[PDB]
Amino acid sequence: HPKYSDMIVAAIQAEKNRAGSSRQSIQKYIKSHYKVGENADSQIKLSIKRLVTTGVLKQTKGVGASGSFRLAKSDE
DNA sequence: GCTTTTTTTTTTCACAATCCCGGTGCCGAGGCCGCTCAATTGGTCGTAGACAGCTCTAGCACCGCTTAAACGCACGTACGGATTC
Ligand SMILES: [Ca+2]
Ligand SMILES: [Ca+2]
16 A cells, blocks of 8 residues: 555545545545555544645635645645 | 590480471452553654765784893791690
């Protein structure tokens, strides 16, 4: 298997559609070829929690925990 | 060679200590139970250190002289240790 910032790239990159990108449609695609452990959902929200704050991923619209994201940082 | 007497050896009577039975009694080892908190699973992230490669410190070897030091022996003193008190 590959890492979870390896997995988060594959869903949003391949197709590009529902709610810009959001939490359910990412986890549906991700499970098909990561091969699911129980920790999948726990370390997929953690991967998002540190990727949104670093600059690799930037968020479109939300409040606190919920929302929707993109890949290209804002103004870049 | 005898006596006497002093020392040492031998036995012969004692007594705490031990052990094996029995029997009894109590409390803490040893196990159970219902948690929870600390080890485990999994993945992410950053650097500690094996490893290769270079430098060049300093550790080893070698020699031949000078003489301080070690070695060995002659000699007798004051020490160690036995004995006695
Ligand atoms: Ca479960
Ligand atoms: Ca280093």
